[PDB]
Design an enzyme around this catalytic site. Structure first.
Site, PDB file in Angstrom:
ATOM      1  CE1 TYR A 112       0.335   4.692   3.275  1.00  0.00           C
ATOM      2  CE2 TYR A 112       0.142   5.659   5.459  1.00  0.00           C
ATOM      3  CZ  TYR A 112      -0.132   5.693   4.100  1.00  0.00           C
ATOM      4  OH  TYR A 112      -0.877   6.714   3.549  1.00  0.00           O
ATOM      5  N   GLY A 113       5.374   0.830   5.067  1.00  0.00           N
ATOM      6  CA  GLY A 113       6.116  -0.385   5.338  1.00  0.00           C
ATOM      7  C   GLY A 113       5.569  -1.586   4.596  1.00  0.00           C
ATOM      8  CG  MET A 114       6.281  -6.272   3.912  1.00  0.00           C
ATOM      9  SD  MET A 114       7.499  -5.906   2.620  1.00  0.00           S
ATOM     10  CE  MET A 114       8.613  -4.790   3.467  1.00  0.00           C
ATOM     11  CB  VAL A 115       0.858  -2.211   5.024  1.00  0.00           C
ATOM     12  CG1 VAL A 115      -0.664  -2.315   5.060  1.00  0.00           C
ATOM     13  CG2 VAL A 115       1.406  -1.925   6.412  1.00  0.00           C
ATOM     14  CG  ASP A 129       4.032  10.016  12.170  1.00  0.00           C
ATOM     15  OD1 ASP A 129       4.150   9.087  11.339  1.00  0.00           O
ATOM     16  OD2 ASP A 129       4.486  11.164  11.971  1.00  0.00           O
ATOM     17  CE  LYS A 135       2.688  -3.148  11.040  1.00  0.00           C
ATOM     18  NZ  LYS A 135       2.732  -1.726  11.504  1.00  0.00           N
ATOM     19  CB  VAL A 179      -0.973   0.009   1.198  1.00  0.00           C
ATOM     20  CG1 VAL A 179      -1.804  -1.264   1.231  1.00  0.00           C
ATOM     21  CG2 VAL A 179      -0.221   0.204   2.498  1.00  0.00           C
ATOM     22  N   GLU A 239       2.770   2.677  -2.126  1.00  0.00           N
ATOM     23  CA  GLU A 239       4.111   2.530  -2.696  1.00  0.00           C
ATOM     24  C   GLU A 239       5.152   2.226  -1.619  1.00  0.00           C
TER      25      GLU A 239
END
Ligand SMILES: CC(C)CS(=O)(=O)NCc1cccc(-c2ccc3c(NC(=O)C4CC4)n[nH]c3c2)c1
Ligand SMILES: [Cl-]
Length: 302
Positions: free
Chosen positions: A22-25, A133, A40, A17, A19
């Site tokens: 938000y990491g490996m989501v 954040d 996730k 998600v 690109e």
């Protein structure tokens, strides 16, 4: 306890998600129902009983945090010894709207967005959860205009833009609280109306300059922490003798809006309003917008 696992076999991984922001989501399609979800990886191995204990505490809390203005946990799946959390997928963020309206959003649109953001953040605060954040990227927006906040910061679970960070975060105050989210919300008030970030700093010290040249000197606690913080290499804060107030930078903005922003942006975190006090503000209460929109928000029930 009360935790039963679904299967990863029904999901097809369409890619990360946002690109990979938000990491490996993983953006995933449920091949049984066509629903699109965000998955996730949550646990590398449930073989470790201690890591397993901590993980179930977090799942228990995520289930308690079900709310119309939060991305919600849909299920937990297990593949081999791994756990995966399945959350809702939301197509757009508030960035898409800011990109369509680079000279500011419509007044009622800002009302609806801020109402929902404050509603969602206030809910988490009532569970002693701080986001920490908030930024346009984390404010998702459904096709129906329903805001869904995402990527909260969780304690006891264990580069980035600083534009929305409160002074207590910048000077390294470990006693920061829920007021950091209210500061971030105040940063978004002027941004939505004017089409530009309020404090676009490019380093922690630059961010502090942006803030104080508008809002004045920091509270004594934060100047002392700044002076002790080694990341500033013995450098010292500037002394503000004539700040430029928000209403001077933005003289066309309504008094009600400037009051809302100034309150969220109080230099002293303890003098900022709680999220609930924010919903009672004249910005939301005038002409019964809150009543009307609160019932209008029954597009949440489809
Ligand atoms: C609220 C509760 C306390 C749970 S949580 O939010 O804090 N943790 C769950 C979590 C962690 C990290 C990231 C995400 C995440 C990010 C993005 C999306 C998304 N759309 C998009 O990216 C569109 C391209 C813009 N749809 N769904 C998403 C989910 C979610
Ligand atoms: Cl001001």
């Amino acid at each position: 306890e009360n935790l039963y696992f679904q299967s990863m076999e029904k999901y097809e991984n369409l890619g990360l998600v946002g690109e990979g922001s938000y990491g490996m989501v993983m953006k995933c399609r449920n091949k049984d129902t066509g629903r699109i979800v965000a998955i996730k990886k949550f646990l590398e191995s449930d073989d470790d009983k201690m890591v397993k204990k901590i993980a179930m505490r977090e799942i228990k809390l995520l289930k308690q945090l079900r709310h119309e203005n939060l991305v919600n946990l849909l299920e937990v799946c297990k593949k081999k010894k791994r756990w995966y959390l399945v959350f809702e997928f939301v197509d757009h963020t508030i960035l898409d709207d800011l990109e369509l309206f680079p000279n500011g959003l419509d007044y009622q649109v800002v009302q609806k967005y801020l109402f929902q953001i404050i509603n969602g953040i206030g809910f988490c605060h009532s569970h002693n959860i701080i986001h920490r954040d908030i930024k346009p990227e984390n404010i998702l927006v459904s096709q129906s205009g329903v805001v869904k906040l995402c990527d909260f910061g969780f304690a006891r679970t264990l580069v980035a833009t600083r534009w929305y960070r409160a002074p207590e975060l910048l000077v390294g105050d470990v006693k920061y609280g829920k007021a950091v989210d209210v500061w971030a919300i105040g940063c978004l008030v002027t941004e939505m109306f004017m089409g530009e970030p309020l404090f676009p700093g490019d380093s922690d010290i630059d961010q502090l300059y942006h803030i104080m040249m508008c809002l004045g000197n920091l509270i004594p606690r934060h100047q002392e922490l700044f002076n002790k913080n080694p990341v500033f290499a013995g450098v010292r804060l500037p002394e503000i003798k004539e700040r430029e107030p928000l209403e001077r930078r933005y003289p066309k903005l309504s008094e009600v809006v400037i009051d809302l922003a100034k309150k969220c942006l109080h230099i002293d975190p303890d003098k900022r309003p709680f999220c609930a006090e924010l919903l009672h503000h004249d910005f939301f209460q005038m002409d019964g917008f809150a009543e009307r929109f609160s019932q209008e928000l029954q597009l949440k029930v489809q």
